[PDB]
Design an enzyme around this catalytic site. Structure first.
Site, short mmCIF file in Angstrom:
data_model
loop_
_atom_site.label_atom_id
_atom_site.label_comp_id
_atom_site.label_asym_id
_atom_site.label_seq_id
_atom_site.Cartn_x
_atom_site.Cartn_y
_atom_site.Cartn_z
N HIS A 314 -38.39 106.01 38.14
CA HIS A 314 -37.98 104.65 38.47
C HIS A 314 -37.17 104.01 37.34
O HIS A 314 -37.65 103.88 36.21
CB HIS A 314 -39.23 103.81 38.78
CG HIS A 314 -38.88 102.44 39.27
ND1 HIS A 314 -38.87 102.11 40.61
CD2 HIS A 314 -38.47 101.34 38.60
CE1 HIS A 314 -38.48 100.84 40.73
NE2 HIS A 314 -38.23 100.36 39.53
N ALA A 315 -35.94 103.61 37.65
CA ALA A 315 -34.99 103.17 36.63
C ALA A 315 -35.51 102.01 35.78
O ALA A 315 -36.06 101.05 36.31
CB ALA A 315 -33.68 102.72 37.29
N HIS A 344 -27.18 97.09 36.92
CA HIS A 344 -28.41 96.30 36.76
C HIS A 344 -29.09 96.62 35.44
O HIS A 344 -29.41 95.72 34.65
CB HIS A 344 -29.36 96.55 37.93
CG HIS A 344 -30.68 95.85 37.79
ND1 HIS A 344 -30.83 94.53 38.16
CD2 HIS A 344 -31.86 96.22 37.24
CE1 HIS A 344 -32.08 94.14 37.91
NE2 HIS A 344 -32.72 95.15 37.32
N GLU A 345 -29.26 97.92 35.16
CA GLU A 345 -29.96 98.35 33.96
C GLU A 345 -29.13 98.04 32.71
O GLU A 345 -29.68 97.66 31.68
CB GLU A 345 -30.30 99.85 34.04
CG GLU A 345 -31.26 100.17 35.21
CD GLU A 345 -32.58 99.46 35.15
OE1 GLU A 345 -32.98 99.01 34.06
OE2 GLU A 345 -33.24 99.34 36.22
N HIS A 348 -29.73 94.53 31.48
CA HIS A 348 -30.89 94.42 30.59
C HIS A 348 -30.52 94.81 29.16
O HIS A 348 -30.88 94.10 28.21
CB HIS A 348 -32.02 95.32 31.08
CG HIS A 348 -32.73 94.86 32.31
ND1 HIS A 348 -33.24 93.58 32.46
CD2 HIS A 348 -33.05 95.52 33.45
CE1 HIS A 348 -33.86 93.49 33.63
NE2 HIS A 348 -33.74 94.66 34.25
N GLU A 372 -33.05 89.75 35.03
CA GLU A 372 -32.73 90.58 36.17
C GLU A 372 -31.34 90.33 36.71
O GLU A 372 -30.79 91.20 37.39
CB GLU A 372 -33.76 90.33 37.26
CG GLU A 372 -35.16 90.68 36.90
CD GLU A 372 -35.33 92.10 36.41
OE1 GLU A 372 -34.53 92.95 36.84
OE2 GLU A 372 -36.20 92.35 35.56
N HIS A 474 -43.79 98.52 41.70
CA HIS A 474 -44.22 97.39 40.85
C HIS A 474 -45.71 97.07 40.98
O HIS A 474 -46.24 96.38 40.11
CB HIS A 474 -43.38 96.17 41.20
CG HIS A 474 -41.92 96.43 41.02
ND1 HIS A 474 -41.24 97.33 41.81
CD2 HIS A 474 -41.02 95.97 40.11
CE1 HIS A 474 -39.99 97.41 41.42
NE2 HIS A 474 -39.82 96.61 40.38
N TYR A 484 -37.19 89.00 40.94
CA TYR A 484 -36.08 89.53 41.73
C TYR A 484 -35.61 88.53 42.77
O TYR A 484 -34.41 88.50 43.10
CB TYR A 484 -36.48 90.86 42.38
CG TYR A 484 -36.87 91.89 41.35
CD1 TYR A 484 -35.95 92.44 40.49
CD2 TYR A 484 -38.19 92.26 41.22
CE1 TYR A 484 -36.33 93.36 39.52
CE2 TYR A 484 -38.59 93.19 40.26
CZ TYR A 484 -37.65 93.72 39.41
OH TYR A 484 -38.04 94.67 38.47
C1 LIG Z 1 -34.84 102.49 41.81
C2 LIG Z 1 -34.03 101.34 41.07
C3 LIG Z 1 -35.02 100.36 40.41
C4 LIG Z 1 -34.30 99.29 39.60
C5 LIG Z 1 -35.24 98.22 39.07
N1 LIG Z 1 -36.22 98.77 38.12
C6 LIG Z 1 -36.91 97.72 37.34
C7 LIG Z 1 -37.88 98.35 36.31
C8 LIG Z 1 -38.65 97.24 35.59
C9 LIG Z 1 -39.84 97.72 34.69
C10 LIG Z 1 -40.46 96.76 33.93
C11 LIG Z 1 -41.51 97.10 33.11
C12 LIG Z 1 -41.94 98.43 33.06
C13 LIG Z 1 -41.32 99.38 33.86
C14 LIG Z 1 -40.26 99.03 34.66
C15 LIG Z 1 -35.94 96.84 36.64
O1 LIG Z 1 -35.00 97.28 35.92
O2 LIG Z 1 -36.07 95.63 36.81
C16 LIG Z 1 -36.06 97.58 40.18
O3 LIG Z 1 -37.25 97.68 40.25
N2 LIG Z 1 -35.35 96.79 41.13
C17 LIG Z 1 -36.13 96.17 42.21
C18 LIG Z 1 -35.21 95.26 43.05
C19 LIG Z 1 -33.90 96.01 43.43
C20 LIG Z 1 -33.75 96.93 44.47
N3 LIG Z 1 -32.51 97.38 44.47
C21 LIG Z 1 -31.80 96.80 43.49
C22 LIG Z 1 -30.46 96.95 43.10
C23 LIG Z 1 -29.98 96.21 42.03
C24 LIG Z 1 -30.81 95.33 41.36
C25 LIG Z 1 -32.14 95.17 41.74
C26 LIG Z 1 -32.64 95.93 42.81
C27 LIG Z 1 -36.75 97.26 43.06
O4 LIG Z 1 -36.39 98.48 43.01
O5 LIG Z 1 -37.66 96.95 43.88
ZN LIG Z 2 -34.35 94.79 36.16
#
Ligand SMILES: CCCC[C@H](N[C@@H](CCc1ccccc1)C(=O)O)C(=O)N[C@@H](Cc1c[nH]c2ccccc12)C(=O)O
Ligand SMILES: [Zn+2]
Ligand SMILES: *[C@@H]1O[C@H](CO[C@@H]2O[C@@H](C)[C@@H](O)[C@@H](O)[C@@H]2O)[C@@H](O[C@@H]2O[C@H](CO)[C@@H](O[C@@H]3O[C@H](CO)[C@@H](O)[C@H](O)[C@@H]3O)[C@H](O)[C@H]2NC(C)=O)[C@H](O)[C@H]1NC(C)=O
Ligand SMILES: *[C@@H]1O[C@H](CO)[C@@H](O)[C@H](O)[C@H]1NC(C)=O
Ligand SMILES: [Cl-]
Ligand SMILES: [Cl-]
EC number: 3.4.15.1
Length: 586
Positions: A314-315, A344-345, A348, A372, A474, A484
């Site tokens: 998970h990214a 997105h990443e 951060h 975010e 999450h 988000y």
């Molecule tokens: C599989 C991709 C996950 C990316 C993200 N990953 C998180 C990890 C955070 C974390 C914190 C502490 C410890 C470990 C991890 C982040 O970077 O915020 C994520 O969760 N996006 C959400 C919403 C979304 C879906 N599509 C998108 C496209 C673009 C932007 C947002 C979203 C989701 O996938 O539900």
């Molecule tokens: Zn994020």
């Protein structure tokens, strides 16, 4: 008096950098190499950082913050008085850390197996099935299988997790963990503000939902779609039905204006994960923002390892608390969806670099939603047909009203569909934390919200023992979600403001801020504040006013709302799901 408090903050800042850097290293090593040994080291570093947090937190609580004159020192010390999990007694702290590690490991190694056949991981295998299969039973196999293997396996942990995270919250002066999480916004009106924003997006979401429901009826058959009921949750192109753009092929408004297959274009043009992140880095520097350091490229994990390692796919983006070492860990697939995730990443990472010289307690986004939103703002410009054509991933699509409505639909399938999903996740957890959802009815109350807010129903009736929230990253990873929702609202406010700063005229959805130094300066000044000021100050620096508002998002999508209303009225759609009790018969 003031002098002892200043000295305390300086000592906290010095020692925190060292211990958090060591923790981040152990946490990275586990996340990129799940083994018994790296797990054992991680749990040990958990106790080391708790010892530090307890030492300094106990000191911080001896200060009466009311009597401190300097507001920055006051703010830091108030924050350090919250020990988070280090407030727990040692036995409970150890149990909690082990529960968190067990939950996140369970999610990240779960697989779904065919009988005497292959076993599929979530990424890339099951997500690819959800995105590309157009066969009801194959989608159902992946959707149900994932919940059976990942969700059901988290249930044994979740009640004790809830007890312990709430216990820690109470020991830090909150009433429960959801109160603690909401406090990160420092906004007493948060719940009402979020509800008002959600309600403003209802016309767009209900019209999108009705249009997509009609298209699904056309493809999957009248016996499987109720035109007055909720949509089955496995048909939307995504494991959680949280974004719907992978079913664009089924819903395209003008099929006589087709788009180039962007995955095949990326593959034919030799794109790799590193190229995707390089393009993101180029967009940031085009705005005059910071490049990622050379170390990022040496140390990041930008694709799934092939060497037998198990990893958390998970990214995510990582700050190692030394102002130099920033990394991304993502199991990148070469497609457009993951190019957006890469941006997105990288947002951060940008934030980390911008606030690196603040005291650690202030090294956060203005609120979690701001952290975010940064990368997503740039991705709005990357996603424009003009920009994608410059990357040779689309043909020329300009000068066409049909291509224009098609693009807006593609964008709505992700951005508008996500609004109700992102609202409901922490509506559920806040009520788990405050005790009004118990383990008796975790899953029923989840589905009540999936119905109420998203208009979805499960394709297979749930049974006792199911814990479908556990199948969403999450939940077992204990990452708050309302960030988000906030992000998806404010990223359009930021886009609107940056486009105006860049001199764009015309419809907001045609804006591309590539190379705008005026746009970059707005973002940079806000990000440099970190968490040093109330978030309305950062909102003001970017947008010229201090409120969260859905007006920008509504403006972006106005031409699509008009098109959807005309289309839905032509077909006689009944918006919403008054037949809200409908579920699939077979
Ligand atoms: C599989 C991709 C996950 C990316 C993200 N990953 C998180 C990890 C955070 C974390 C914190 C502490 C410890 C470990 C991890 C982040 O970077 O915020 C994520 O969760 N996006 C959400 C919403 C979304 C879906 N599509 C998108 C496209 C673009 C932007 C947002 C979203 C989701 O996938 O539900
Ligand atoms: Zn994020
Ligand atoms: C309240 O206190 C804050 C914090 O002060 C800082 O932290 C304390 C623990 C002590 O170590 C202090 O010695 C230390 O300065 C004050 O904020 C700080 O103000 C100074 C001067 O206005 C800022 O200096 C800048 O520093 C950068 C480099 O970081 C230079 O490039 C600039 O040219 C400029 O010199 C400093 O950034 C700022 N720090 C923070 C964290 O905000 C604050 O001024 C004070 N309030 C009052 C009313 O005195
Ligand atoms: C994975 O962890 C094990 C145990 O600590 C270690 O021996 C091995 O070198 C690690 N692999 C990588 C690629 O870092
Ligand atoms: Cl679900
Ligand atoms: Cl949050």
């Amino acid at each position: 008096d003031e002098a002892e408090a200043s000295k305390f903050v300086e000592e906290y800042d010095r020692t925190s950098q060292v211990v958090w850097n060591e923790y981040a290293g152990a946490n990275w090593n586990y996340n990129t190499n799940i083994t018994t040994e790296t797990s054992k080291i991680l749990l040990q570093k958990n106790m080391q950082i708790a010892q530090h947090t307890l030492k300094y937190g106990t000191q911080a609580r001896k200060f009466d913050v009311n009597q401190l004159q300097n507001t920055t020192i006051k703010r830091i010390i108030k924050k350090v008085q919250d020990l988070e999990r280090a407030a727990l007694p040692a036995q409970e702290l150890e149990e909690y850390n082990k529960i968190l590690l067990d939950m996140e490991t369970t999610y990240s190694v779960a697989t779904v197996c065919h009988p005497q056949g292959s076993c599929l991981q979530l990424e890339p295998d099951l997500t690819n099935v959800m995105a590309t299969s157009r066969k009801y039973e194959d989608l159902l196999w992946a959707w149900e299988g994932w919940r059976d293997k990942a969700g059901r396996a988290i249930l044994q942990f979740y009640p004790k997790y809830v007890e312990l995270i709430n216990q820690a919250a109470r020991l830090n002066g909150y009433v429960d963990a959801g109160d603690s999480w909401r406090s990160m916004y420092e906004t007493p009106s948060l719940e009402q503000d979020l509800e008002r924003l959600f309600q403003e997006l209802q016309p767009l979401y209900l019209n999108l939902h009705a249009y997509v429901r009609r298209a699904l009826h056309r493809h999957y058959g009248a016996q499987h779609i109720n035109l007055e009921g909720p949509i089955p949750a496995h048909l939307l192109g995504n494991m959680w039905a949280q974004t719907w753009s992978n079913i664009y092929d089924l819903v395209v408004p003008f099929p006589s204006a087709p788009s180039m297959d962007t995955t095949e274009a990326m593959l034919k043009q030799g794109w790799t994960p590193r190229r995707m992140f390089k393009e993101a880095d180029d967009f940031f520097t085009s705005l005059g923002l910071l490049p990622v350091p050379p170390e990022f490229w040496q140390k990041s994990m930008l694709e799934k390892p092939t060497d037998g390692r198990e990893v958390v796919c998970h990214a995510s983006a990582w700050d190692f608390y030394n102002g130099k070492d920033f990394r991304i860990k993502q199991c990148t697939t070469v497609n457009l969806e993951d190019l957006v995730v890469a941006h997105h990443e990288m947002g951060h990472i940008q934030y980390f670099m911008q606030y690196k010289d603040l005291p650690v307690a202030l090294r956060e986004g203005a609120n979690p939603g701001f952290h975010e939103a940064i990368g997503d703002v740039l991705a709005l410009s990357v996603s424009t047909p003009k920009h994608l054509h410059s990357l040779n991933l689309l043909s020329s699509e300009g000068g066409s009203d049909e291509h224009d409505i098609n693009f807006l639909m593609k964008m709505a399938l992700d951005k508008i569909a996500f609004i109700p999903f992102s609202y409901l996740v922490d509506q559920w957890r806040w009520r788990v934390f405050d005790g009004s959802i118990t383990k008796e009815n975790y899953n029923q109350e989840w589905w009540s919200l999936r119905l109420k807010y998203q208009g979805l129903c499960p394709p297979v009736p749930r049974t006792q023992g199911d814990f479908d929230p556990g199948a969403k990253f999450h939940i077992p990873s204990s990452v708050p979600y309302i960030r988000y929702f906030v992000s998806f609202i404010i990223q359009f406010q930021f886009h609107e403001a940056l486009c105006q700063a860049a001199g764009h005229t015309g419809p907001l959805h045609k804006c591309d801020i590539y190379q705008s130094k005026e746009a970059g300066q707005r973002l940079a000044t806000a990000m440099k504040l970190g968490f040093s000021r109330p978030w309305p100050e950062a909102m003001q620096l970017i947008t010229g006013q201090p409120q969260m508002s859905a007006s920008a998002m509504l403006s972006y999508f106005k031409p699509l709302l008009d098109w959807l209303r005309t289309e839905n009225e032509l077909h006689g759609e009944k918006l919403g799901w008054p037949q809200y009790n409908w579920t699939p018969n077979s």
